Amino acid sequence: PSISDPTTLLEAERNDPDGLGLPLKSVPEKVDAYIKKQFEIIKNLEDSVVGLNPQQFIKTDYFYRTSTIFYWIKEMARGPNKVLLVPYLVDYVLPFLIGLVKHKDVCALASLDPVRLYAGLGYMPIRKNHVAAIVDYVCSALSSNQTKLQLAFIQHFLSAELLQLTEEEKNKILEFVVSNLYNEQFVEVRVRAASILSDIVHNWKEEQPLLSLIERFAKGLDVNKYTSKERQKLSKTDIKIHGNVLGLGAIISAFPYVFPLPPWIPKQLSNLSSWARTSGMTGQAAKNTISEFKKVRADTWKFDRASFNTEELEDLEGVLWRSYYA
Amino acid sequence: MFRNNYDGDTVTFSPTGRLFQVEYALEAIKQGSVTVGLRSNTHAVLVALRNADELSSYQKKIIKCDEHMGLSLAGLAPDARVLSNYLRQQCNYSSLVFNRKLAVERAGHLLCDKAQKNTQSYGGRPYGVGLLIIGYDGAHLLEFQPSGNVTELYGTAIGARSQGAKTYLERTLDTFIKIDGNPDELIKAGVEAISQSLRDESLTVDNLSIAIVGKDTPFTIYDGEAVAKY
Amino acid sequence: VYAINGSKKDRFFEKLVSLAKAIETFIHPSNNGFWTKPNAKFVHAFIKSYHGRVKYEEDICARGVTNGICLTSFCHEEIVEIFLNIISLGSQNKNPDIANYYISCFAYLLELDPSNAYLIYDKILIDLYDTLADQFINSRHRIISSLKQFTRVIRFIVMDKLYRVHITNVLSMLVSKLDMNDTNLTSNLINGIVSIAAFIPIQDLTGEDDYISFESDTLPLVQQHFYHIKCGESSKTFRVDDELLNNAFKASTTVFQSMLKVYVEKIFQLVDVDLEDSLVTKINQTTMILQESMDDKIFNYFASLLQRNFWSNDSFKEKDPNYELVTIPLAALVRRNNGLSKELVRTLLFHIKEQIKRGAGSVRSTSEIQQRDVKLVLYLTALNDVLRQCHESLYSDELITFMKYLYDNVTNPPLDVITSIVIHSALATLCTTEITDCRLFPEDSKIPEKDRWGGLQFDPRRFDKQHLSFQWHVPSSDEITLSISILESLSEYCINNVEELMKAPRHDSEYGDMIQKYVLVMTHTLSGSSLLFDPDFNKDIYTCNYYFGNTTEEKLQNPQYLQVHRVRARIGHFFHKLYVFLSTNFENNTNMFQILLHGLKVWFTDLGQETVFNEDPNAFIDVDFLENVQSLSHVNEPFTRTNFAIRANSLHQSRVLLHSTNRKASKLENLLLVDIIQLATSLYPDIYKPAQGTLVHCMKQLVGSYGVVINKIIPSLEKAIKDHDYMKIQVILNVLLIKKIHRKLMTDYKDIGRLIFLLIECCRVNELEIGMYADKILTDIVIGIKIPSSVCVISDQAFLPLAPPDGTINLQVEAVKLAKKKKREYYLSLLVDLQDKLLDKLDNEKMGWKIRMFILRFVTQIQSNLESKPDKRAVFSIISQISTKHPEIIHLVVKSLLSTCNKIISLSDYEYDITRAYKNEFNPSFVEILDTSTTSFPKTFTEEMNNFDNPKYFIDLRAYVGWLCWGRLMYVMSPKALKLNLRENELEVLKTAGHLLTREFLRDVTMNLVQDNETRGFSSGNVSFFSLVILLISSGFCE
Amino acid sequence: EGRLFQVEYSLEAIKLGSTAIGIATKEGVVLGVEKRATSPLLESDSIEKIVEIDRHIGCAMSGLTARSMIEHARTAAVTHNLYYDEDINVESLTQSVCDLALRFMSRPFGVALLIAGHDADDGYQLFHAEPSGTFYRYNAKAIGSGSEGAQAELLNEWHSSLTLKEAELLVLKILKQVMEEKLDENNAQLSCITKQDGFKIYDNEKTAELIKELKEKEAA
Amino acid sequence: GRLYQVEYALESISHAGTAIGIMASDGIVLAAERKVTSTLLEQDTSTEKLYKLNDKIAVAVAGLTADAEILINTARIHAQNYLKTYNEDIPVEILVRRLSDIKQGYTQHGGLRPFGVSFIYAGYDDRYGYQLYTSNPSGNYTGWKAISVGANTSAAQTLLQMDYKDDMKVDDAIELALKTLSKTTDSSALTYDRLEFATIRKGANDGEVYQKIFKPQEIKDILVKTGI
């Protein structure tokens, strides 16, 4: 900082009425411009490796500067030099890493792990001003691996900023996760979105949002408007059904140790049983949900049996389908 | 919450005299699918209903132990394989040394004796499969539990919502007990029983397997286009 | 906690709810990791701080008006709602400490008296009833946790009208559930029983004609309430009528006798169970609390039952029985009603004789106790009973005759030790001021028998003097006369017996056993009448209940005082005579010497107070135990009458054990100290270690004994060296290793040099570990030698406020200062003389390298000190040690040269003013202060940091000023060269050091350092040495 | 209660290693594996995740090569040929491998395998053998990283009227989708099992030509 | 991948007695220091730390006695087996490697505590002449010219490095070992009853008398002549 006198420092600290002062250290204009110029050069040198194999990729100056910048970024996120890297996250660092993600064999040859650093960047000491920008950026072309890494970063950021995010930011994250639940390109993305949705729902306290989400997920899961043949056909082709089942299972899984069991959980398990009795991705998801529910509640199952009738208890038996089971 | 200090191994008794590992092995049968066993005065049948996905085959549930005896399984496949191999060896010994076909009751006794040894040894594990054994002619039907118990029933059902079939058999006992001389009607009765245990699921030529053995009829397994209710 | 506003609290409680929801899954028992201890600690600390703030706010509001910042009842309700399901999850933790951390919060939650405490009460009651019904037989942790929670909340359940009805029933179910295999379960049950008993009176509260019964009234209501609660409902909806009061105490207080009978039979069963000492003490405390919580009728019933079971039982079958589980409660009865003492005591005597008649104690088994001495039981009982007879002893002659018969008819060392305590109990009971009444409620209590079921823990009447009219025991003239007569008779009897034995000495075991028994009887006679002794007899504030009075005129007018002290002097003389006889006739014996050492320890440490048995468990309520039972933080003493009585007794005992027994040693005391010193330098480890302990105790008691000890140790060590008595040398070194003497040696400037020379002489003897011990002592002396200082930077305000308004105090202060300065200079001169003598020894003799290392280290320690005058001789001697070619010697020489040169440089820089070494204001002349508050300073600093040609200042170490902001004065180094303003002596020393810094010297030092280096660790000492060489070269001192 | 969860944990081999895909048709069985990108000077020929059991039976794996199962399968096939003067059935060899896993059940042994073969009884057969001592007959099956999406693609594409060339093209396309493009000839390895030629492993030139044909088909 | 048991064994050996082995151009000298004293413990326990494996090889021990006895018995059996098999004396390196392999095997299999013993081998054969080796619990063996094990290893190594020559004689090696031991013991002065000595030398006649173990009188005479 090197301020002229304590009076100027105190005046600058208390300028913002929010109570949060200035960053401890700041990058001067010259160094900031130098770093931005390096990133711009890397971005502009993208046309030299358009059609090169990894062996030809590993030899260009573009790869050399990419490796130098990767090493610099990894060194920055190591200790006292953390507050300085924060302003470069949205515009320079995260796009750079997500672009490096597309190069699997290149990173394997160069012994680089962009995924680990990208995931670990969610625990940075991010101040209030940058939180909104990061939330807007993460929720927004990308491939399946890039989308899954983005979901992992969102999960870690939520775990690190659980009591810091506002209601608007949490709503944006929830909407992004729900949208990923209905992904039209990848299934693993949908499964990871279901996991993140369960993590989000676990921290809800008011019953009204939970009831609204349960209603939205179970609106399309009614079995009175279909037949067994139709249900089995939908279990293998329909994407909306798969997303709704994943969301309902995530909601159910967000309540592992509730005692006594709330009345809505047996109803949702009964709704999911009909889909668990079919064959397909929806059936697999429902079976996984029921198996997890029965595994987590094995300690209190003797007391939890009272929440189900005979038919409901009987419908939750054959959900583990493994080659060693017959 | 509610941690159990007496469910570790099979050589520890509960303070009330229970063996929790044996009970868990018994509950392991519920994981497997549904099997139904009948018995008339002249014939005995078995009906069995899994598929990993649309590109996979279906698990075998009925195993032939000899030309006059057979079984169906529900639970762990390798345990059923070991028990079936042991029963085949016992039948072979009986047919070789004495030229005598082994009785179903003796087979149940041997299965119980073998299964008892895994509940007292420590360091091992009880069996995790339930069996339905049917035999020659009079006809016999046994239900074997991994705890080491045999029943000699007229009919029963095991695994994956089999209570409906069991209740149907309890209702229609007197109806199906005397269908001697008509194996097809007994097979149809078993098919109806196994249908009573299905939660709206249908039966096809890929999910249904049948076994029949009676007087003058050697043990026979029907699968594929042979379970088309012909 | 202190960010909560009573009027505006919605946002804070929403944040707290969110945090609790976040940590809920991390608190679950099945999920252990690094987050368990933090979560438990956070919950405990937050709840404790919240309770403390609430208590502070209510205390403030009780003395005026209520502000809008203070918490309300709604805050307490919200806190209870938030922390529910968190304490419950944490109570089932696998690690007991985490479970205790979570469980401890129930008391804090119930102290606030929230409107929703029914949730906690119902949950704990359901858990306890399920546990006692064997519903958790597969889970031990749930049983233990339920017991712990009930133990925590007993004192808050006991104050609720609805929940009182459940106490006594549970009190039964806990008593019958005591085990003989599960010791931890029994400990938890005993904790619950203690908690129940400490807050209820054990009395029948039914009136004259109630016609009410436990079975028909209490049980139906309890069952209905339990069913209502466990069905899924709360106690709010449970409506009752006035018949609950019939189901209350009127019917529930009639079930105590069966519980007491079951408890007595359980104790008699536990007598034959191998148990830890702490559990036995806890059970004894349980029984005593139960006894003191009873009324007269139940107390009489319990006493009769206990005596009946004691005289007829099927216990004490094992060879290691727990006698104190029965003997201690029995004496407790005698504490409450001494009228029961007589016949019971008589019976004991009779039974004892019967055991002697059947042949008990006729087989010597000095190692242990064999299964032929059930008589011991009676013995122990007698002890405890005789400990609390108080004035109910004026059967004195019968007891004295019985004691003489016992001491003349029994000869067995394990049995002799036990029998020797009868006299101690008899003497101590008649002359010890102590309390006798500790009941929860007195028999003639004005408190109505309807507000007694809490012990008045939360009621101001617990402070009433009427309620706290404790009954004490104060010795009378008859008791003192009886004690004196008993003491004189026993002393004469023992002295005559021992003299008769010494008339015709023998060598068999019976002779030694009889001598040891008589000496033990003498010791216990000394210890029993300890309170009758005056520590200042030869020649205060805390005036305890000394019978003979205070001051000195009153004491000298009572002949009993003088005759007691005459008896004590005679006992001491006889102890000396016995020591002489044992030394001259029984040198190889060990047990008799140990008994004599214990006797001397008792005779020296019992000049008016008792310390041998003051720490042993007895039939008194433990102050620490009862305090731990009834203590709540932020609450001003929520105690009971028993707690206040035991606290008063403890304070009296402390005031008794607060007097100073330090005195000038008399002729007898000096002679006994000499005897103990001689026994301390013995050859048998079984003898001198207790002798060393007794010597330490006597040195603590006496004043100036250290001088005698050292003045007898030094000649003995010298004589042992002369006669090559290696064992004596080794034991003398071990004695010199005693902590107290070791500490006092570091400031003994008079004889430190002689001891150092003796240690050097010992170092050359190589037959045992003597050399290693001598080297260790020398190293300790080098490390811990105290060099007096003449610098005291002290503010004048540290003594001016306490200045007396007299003009004759200044002269005394000045005289004291002058005398202290003279003594300090004399001590420094002695140290300098010792250093010079060591240098002479080093230079003259050629010598093992250990002594050379010791001498170099001592000279370095002396010279590096700022109060010492540098010497050319020491520097020359240190430098000339490189010829030894020993790497350790060379490293030590380098370090010594560095230290001496640094001391000389400090003398130069301080301008021969050592006080400036501690002055914060003073700075060296080469250090400059720069004002960084100027407008253009940052640019100047930036330019200076880039200035390599003509620097203005230097910063050697880490710079810190200006990293965040400028404005403070900055200390910098001057760019000029450093000069030395040294006088003739320091300049001559530096020239002498430089003259020896030849090329060959440096070559040898560097070669030895390189050769003695097999690892990269470089070394900053070498850099400092090179810098010192550069300085000496640059100043012209080195050629 | 209690249950054998170690077996279930072992069956979670989605992250075990490189993707391996097998497709069974009426003309042969195609096995395709992912080749790791290693140092240019390394001899990539030393990496063999497709192994030959015998002339009519081949195997593919997803985990570490380090072995006992392959040796046991070869020994069983040779022993059956010695004892019965014929070729062992594919299902019989799979059951032998499963029995070997079971004997050497509450603990898993070995790693998952894809066994392809041909015999006169059941034509061309593909089996998935799991470390639980069990196996499943499959009409195309994918293991390793990205196995769920690959299996969904196989469900959408397999139609029982495929040919050997179409099976190879499907294997290459699915491997490219899993590995996200840039698979010329060094990120994949192909092998075939046919009645006439037996078990063969395609050389780099044939794989490069197949990749070129796949690119041409994509261009259309 | 550190081995904690091996480190514990090395630390235990670091508290044991000090042994010194010096190789000259015509002989080898082994010395050891006795530390246990009780004024009633017999000092005629054959040789406490110096042992003979055959007529050509001797060993000095630092560490636990039972493991040392086991290893020495095994080495003697191995040497006799080699002599019976090939009718020739076993080379020193072969026996040293055998013992090192035994130690390594004891440091790899579970349920076996590593040998907390350090060995100094002094041998002679016609392939390399005089040979000096040091073996540790880790199983590594190293050849040396002057080596020391036990308590004051570093100081003794420094002293040997200062005053060792490649062309020393047997008496020079004896004096060097005595002076090195006298300057490192923590018992002030070195005495005959606390010392064990051995020499392996070949004279002008090819007799190869490699079994000279010094008697207490001889040790006293050597100490008097040297001036310790």
Swiss-Prot record, chain B:
Pfam families cross-referenced by the UniProt entry: Proteasome (PF00227), Proteasome_A_N (PF10584)
Linked residues for Glycyl lysine isopeptide (Lys-Gly) (interchain with G-Cter in ubiquitin): K188
SUPFAM superfamilies: N-terminal nucleophile aminohydrolases (Ntn hydrolases)
GO annotations of cellular component type: nucleus; proteasome complex; proteasome core complex, alpha-subunit complex; proteasome storage granule
Compartments where found: Cytoplasm; Nucleus
GO biological process: proteasomal ubiquitin-independent protein catabolic process; proteasome-mediated ubiquitin-dependent protein catabolic process
UniProt keyword terms in alphabetical order: Cytoplasm, Isopeptide bond, Nucleus, Phosphoprotein, Proteasome, Ubl conjugation
Modified residues (Phosphoserine): S14
Source taxon at top rank: Eukaryota
Miscellaneous note of the record: Present with 7210 molecules/cell in log phase SD medium.
Family per record: Belongs to the peptidase T1A family.
Subunit structure: The 26S proteasome consists of a 20S proteasome core and two 19S regulatory subunits. The 20S proteasome core is composed of 28 subunits that are arranged in four stacked rings, resulting in a barrel-shaped structure. The two end rings are each formed by seven alpha subunits, and the two central rings are each formed by seven beta subunits. The catalytic chamber with the active sites is on the inside of the barrel.
The name this protein goes by in its record: Proteasome subunit alpha type-6
Lineage, broadest ranks: Eukaryota, Fungi, Dikarya, Ascomycota, Saccharomycotina
Gene label: PRE5
From Swiss-Prot, chain C:
HEAT repeat positions: 708-747
Domain of life: Eukaryota
Annotated compartments: Nucleus; Cytoplasm
Family per similarity comment: Belongs to the BLM10 family.
Miscellaneous information on this protein: Present with 2600 molecules/cell in log phase SD medium.
Subunit structure as annotated in this protein's UniProt entry: According to PubMed:12973301, colocalizes with nascent proteasome. According to PubMed:15778719, associates with proteasome core particles and also forms a complex with regulatory particle-core particle (RP-CP).
Domain comment (free text): The bromodomain-like (BRDL) region specifically recognizes and binds acetylated histones.
Function: Associated component of the proteasome that specifically recognizes acetylated histones and promotes ATP- and ubiquitin-independent degradation of core histones during DNA damage response. Recognizes and binds acetylated histones via its bromodomain-like (BRDL) region and activates the proteasome by opening the gated channel for substrate entry. Binds to the core proteasome via its C-terminus, which occupies the same binding sites as the proteasomal ATPases, opening the closed structure of the proteasome via an active gating mechanism.
Protein name per its UniProtKB record: Proteasome activator BLM10
Annotated source species: Saccharomyces cerevisiae (strain ATCC 204508 / S288c) (Baker's yeast)
Top-level taxonomy: Eukaryota, Fungi, Dikarya, Ascomycota, Saccharomycotina
Gene giving rise to this polypeptide: BLM10
From Swiss-Prot, chain D:
GO biological process: proteasomal ubiquitin-independent protein catabolic process; proteasome-mediated ubiquitin-dependent protein catabolic process
Transmembrane segments: none
Subcellular location, record wording: Cytoplasm; Nucleus
Keyword Transmembrane attached: no
Phosphoserine: residues carrying this PTM: S39
Family: Belongs to the peptidase T1A family.
Official protein name in the record: Proteasome subunit alpha type-5
Organism name: Saccharomyces cerevisiae (strain ATCC 204508 / S288c) (Baker's yeast)
Taxonomic classification: Eukaryota, Fungi, Dikarya, Ascomycota, Saccharomycotina
From Swiss-Prot, chain E:
Gene3D superfamilies: Glutamine Phosphoribosylpyrophosphate, subunit 1, domain 1
Record's miscellaneous remark: Present with 17100 molecules/cell in log phase SD medium.
Cross-link position per record: Glycyl lysine isopeptide (Lys-Gly) (interchain with G-Cter in ubiquitin): K84, K183, K215
PANTHER family in UniProt: PROTEASOME SUBUNIT ALPHA/BETA
Main location: cytoplasm
Family, per entry: Belongs to the peptidase T1A family.
Keywords annotated in UniProt: Cytoplasm, Isopeptide bond, Nucleus, Proteasome, Ubl conjugation
Keyword Ribosomal protein in annotation: no
The gene coding this protein: PRE9
Keyword set includes Endoplasmic reticulum: no
SUPFAM superfamilies to which the protein is assigned, alphabetical: N-terminal nucleophile aminohydrolases (Ntn hydrolases)
Annotated function: The proteasome degrades poly-ubiquitinated proteins in the cytoplasm and in the nucleus. It is essential for the regulated turnover of proteins and for the removal of misfolded proteins. The proteasome is a multicatalytic proteinase complex that is characterized by its ability to cleave peptides with Arg, Phe, Tyr, Leu, and Glu adjacent to the leaving group at neutral or slightly basic pH. It has an ATP-dependent proteolytic activity.
GO biological process, one term: proteasomal ubiquitin-independent protein catabolic process
Subunit structure, as described in the record: The 26S proteasome consists of a 20S proteasome core and two 19S regulatory subunits. The 20S proteasome core is composed of 28 subunits that are arranged in four stacked rings, resulting in a barrel-shaped structure. The two end rings are each formed by seven alpha subunits, and the two central rings are each formed by seven beta subunits. The catalytic chamber with the active sites is on the inside of the barrel.
